[PDB]
Coordinates of C-alpha atoms and ligand atoms in Angstrom, one line a residue:
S24 CA 3.2 20.4 3.3
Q25 CA 5.3 21.0 7.3
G26 CA 4.4 22.5 9.9
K27 CA 3.8 19.6 13.3
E28 CA 2.5 15.7 12.6
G29 CA 4.8 13.1 12.5
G30 CA 5.3 11.8 9.3
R31 CA 9.1 10.3 9.4
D32 CA 8.8 8.9 13.2
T33 CA 6.2 8.0 13.4
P34 CA 5.1 4.0 16.0
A35 CA 4.7 2.6 12.3
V36 CA 7.3 3.9 10.1
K37 CA 10.0 3.5 12.8
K38 CA 8.5 -0.5 13.6
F39 CA 9.2 -1.4 9.3
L40 CA 11.9 0.5 9.5
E41 CA 13.1 -2.0 12.9
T42 CA 11.5 -5.3 10.7
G43 CA 9.9 -4.2 7.7
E44 CA 6.9 -5.4 9.4
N45 CA 3.9 -2.4 7.9
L46 CA 1.0 -1.7 11.2
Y47 CA -1.8 -0.7 9.5
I48 CA -2.2 -3.8 7.4
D49 CA -5.5 -4.2 7.2
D50 CA -6.2 -1.7 9.7
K51 CA -9.2 0.3 8.6
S52 CA -8.4 3.5 9.1
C53 CA -5.4 3.5 7.6
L54 CA -6.9 2.1 4.5
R55 CA -9.6 4.6 4.1
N56 CA -6.2 7.1 4.0
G57 CA -4.4 4.9 1.4
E58 CA -7.8 4.2 -0.7
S59 CA -7.6 8.7 -1.2
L60 CA -3.8 8.7 -0.9
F61 CA -3.7 5.5 -3.8
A62 CA -6.3 7.6 -5.7
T63 CA -3.7 10.5 -6.5
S64 CA -0.4 10.2 -6.5
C65 CA -1.2 6.0 -8.7
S66 CA -3.8 5.4 -9.8
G67 CA -3.6 7.1 -12.4
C68 CA -1.2 5.0 -14.2
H69 CA -2.1 1.7 -12.6
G70 CA -6.1 2.1 -12.0
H71 CA -8.3 3.1 -9.9
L72 CA -8.3 -0.2 -8.5
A73 CA -4.8 -1.3 -9.1
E74 CA -5.8 -3.0 -12.1
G75 CA -3.7 -1.9 -14.4
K76 CA -3.6 0.7 -17.0
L77 CA -0.9 2.6 -18.6
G78 CA 1.3 0.9 -16.0
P79 CA 0.8 -2.4 -14.4
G80 CA -1.7 -4.0 -12.6
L81 CA -0.6 -4.2 -9.0
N82 CA -3.5 -7.0 -8.2
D83 CA -2.4 -9.6 -9.6
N84 CA 0.8 -12.7 -8.7
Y85 CA 2.9 -11.6 -10.7
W86 CA 5.6 -9.5 -10.8
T87 CA 8.6 -8.1 -13.6
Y88 CA 10.5 -6.5 -9.5
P89 CA 9.1 -9.4 -7.1
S90 CA 11.1 -7.0 -4.4
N91 CA 7.5 -5.7 -4.9
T92 CA 6.1 -8.2 -2.8
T93 CA 7.3 -7.0 0.7
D94 CA 6.3 -3.5 1.7
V95 CA 10.0 -3.0 1.9
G96 CA 10.5 -3.3 -1.1
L97 CA 8.2 -1.8 -3.0
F98 CA 8.8 1.1 -0.1
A99 CA 12.2 1.1 -1.5
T100 CA 10.9 0.9 -5.7
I101 CA 8.3 4.0 -5.0
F102 CA 11.4 6.2 -1.9
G103 CA 14.3 4.8 -4.8
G104 CA 12.7 5.3 -8.4
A105 CA 14.5 8.7 -8.9
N106 CA 14.9 8.3 -12.7
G107 CA 15.8 5.0 -12.2
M108 CA 14.1 1.9 -15.0
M109 CA 11.5 0.6 -12.4
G110 CA 9.2 3.5 -13.5
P111 CA 8.6 6.6 -13.8
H112 CA 7.9 7.1 -9.9
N113 CA 9.3 10.2 -7.4
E114 CA 9.1 10.1 -4.0
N115 CA 6.1 12.4 -3.5
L116 CA 5.0 10.9 -0.5
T117 CA 6.3 10.8 3.9
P118 CA 7.1 7.7 4.5
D119 CA 3.8 7.2 6.6
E120 CA 2.2 8.0 4.1
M121 CA 3.3 5.0 2.2
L122 CA 2.7 3.4 4.5
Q123 CA -0.7 4.0 4.6
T124 CA -0.7 4.0 0.8
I125 CA 0.7 -0.2 0.3
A126 CA -1.7 -0.8 3.1
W127 CA -4.2 0.4 0.4
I128 CA -2.4 -1.7 -2.3
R129 CA -2.0 -4.9 -0.9
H130 CA -6.1 -4.6 0.1
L131 CA -6.5 -4.3 -3.8
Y132 CA -5.0 -7.8 -4.3
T133 CA -7.2 -10.4 -5.5
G134 CA -4.5 -13.0 -6.7
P135 CA -4.1 -16.3 -5.2
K136 CA -3.9 -16.5 -0.8
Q137 CA -1.1 -17.8 -0.7
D138 CA 0.9 -15.5 -3.5
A139 CA 0.6 -13.1 -0.6
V140 CA 3.8 -13.1 0.4
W141 CA 3.1 -8.8 2.5
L142 CA 0.5 -10.8 5.1
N143 CA 1.2 -12.9 7.4
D144 CA -0.2 -16.0 9.0
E145 CA -2.6 -15.1 10.5
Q146 CA -3.6 -11.7 8.1
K147 CA -3.8 -14.7 5.4
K148 CA -6.8 -16.4 7.2
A149 CA -8.4 -12.7 7.0
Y150 CA -7.8 -12.3 3.0
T151 CA -10.2 -11.3 1.0
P152 CA -10.5 -10.9 -2.9
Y153 CA -11.2 -7.3 -3.4
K154 CA -14.4 -6.6 -4.5
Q155 CA -15.4 -3.6 -6.6
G156 CA -18.3 -1.3 -4.1
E157 CA -16.6 -2.3 -1.1
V158 CA -16.8 0.7 1.4
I159 CA -14.6 1.0 4.7
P160 CA -16.5 2.4 7.3
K161 CA -16.5 6.3 7.3
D162 CA -16.7 6.3 11.4
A163 CA -13.2 4.0 11.4
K164 CA -10.5 4.9 14.0
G165 CA -7.2 3.1 14.2
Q166 CA -3.5 3.4 14.2
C167 CA -4.7 6.7 11.5
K168 CA -5.4 10.1 11.9
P169 CA -8.7 10.6 9.4
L170 CA -7.4 12.2 6.5
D171 CA -10.2 14.6 6.4
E172 CA -11.9 14.7 10.4
Ligands
HEM201 C1 3.1 6.5 -5.2 C2 2.2 5.9 -6.6 C3 3.0 4.6 -7.2 C4 3.0 3.6 -6.3 C5 3.0 3.0 -4.9 C6 3.6 3.0 -7.7 C7 4.1 1.1 -7.8 C8 4.4 0.6 -8.8 C9 5.0 -1.0 -8.5 C10 5.8 -1.3 -6.9 C11 5.4 -1.2 -9.8 C12 6.8 -2.1 -10.0 C13 5.2 -3.0 -10.7 C14 5.7 -4.8 -10.8 O1 7.0 -5.4 -10.3 O2 6.2 -5.5 -12.3 C15 5.3 -0.5 -10.9 C16 5.6 -0.2 -12.0 C17 5.6 1.0 -12.9 N1 4.2 2.0 -12.3 FE1 3.5 2.6 -11.0 N2 3.7 3.2 -9.3 C18 3.2 4.4 -8.6 C19 3.3 5.8 -9.5 C20 3.7 5.6 -10.9 C21 2.9 6.8 -11.7 C22 2.5 8.2 -11.4 C23 2.7 6.1 -13.3 C24 3.0 7.5 -14.4 C25 3.6 9.0 -14.5 C26 3.8 5.0 -13.1 C27 3.6 3.9 -13.9 C28 5.0 2.7 -14.0 C29 5.2 2.4 -14.7 C30 4.8 2.7 -16.2 C31 5.4 1.3 -14.4 C32 5.9 0.3 -15.5 C33 8.2 0.1 -15.2 C34 9.0 -1.1 -15.4 O3 8.2 -2.3 -15.8 O4 10.6 -1.0 -15.1 N3 3.2 4.7 -11.7 N4 4.2 1.1 -10.5
CA202 CA1 1.2 -7.6 -11.0

C-alpha cells in the first residue's frame, strides 16, 4: 500500500544493490513470507511448488535465461519484465518483497547442489532438495517481519 514502511531502503535491499547478495536466503521468517508472496504472485503459472504449470519449472537446474541463476538476474527479470521477451511479468512486489520471494524460490529448488549458483559455499552445505509437506515453523523470527503477525 504505502504508509510508513520500508520496501526499497531495508538493510537487505541495500546489501543486495551493493553486492548482489541476498541476505534472506535460508532465513526462516523471510521464507515464510516468500512462500505466501510466491503463492499469490507466481504459483498461478509456475505451480504451487514452482514445478511448472503454464510457466516453466523454476525448481530445477535448467534455465532458459541463465541470468536467472543469480538473484540479481531473477530480480531484473521481474522488475524489468514489463512487456518484454522473458514472460508476462509485471513489477508488483516491492524490492524487499521480491528478495523474500526469490529466497523462497531458491528454497523450492530440487536439483543438483552444485548447480545452485545462488548459494555460497556454506549455504550449499545446508542445501537439501525441497520436499512437499515441509512446514516452516510458524513462530520463526528473523530479518523479516511476519506478513500476518
Ligand atoms: C513475481 C512472480 C513470478 C516470478 C518470480 C516468475 C519468474 C520467472 C522466471 C525466473 C522465468 C524464467 C525461467 C527460465 O529462465 O528458465 C519465468 C518464465 C515465465 N513465466 Fe514467470 N514468474 C512469475 C510470475 C508469472 C506469472 C504470473 C505468469 C503468467 C501470467 C508467468 C509466466 C511465465 C512464462 C509463460 C514464462 C516463460 C517465458 C519464456 O520462456 O520466455 N510468470 N518466470
Ligand atoms: Ca527451469
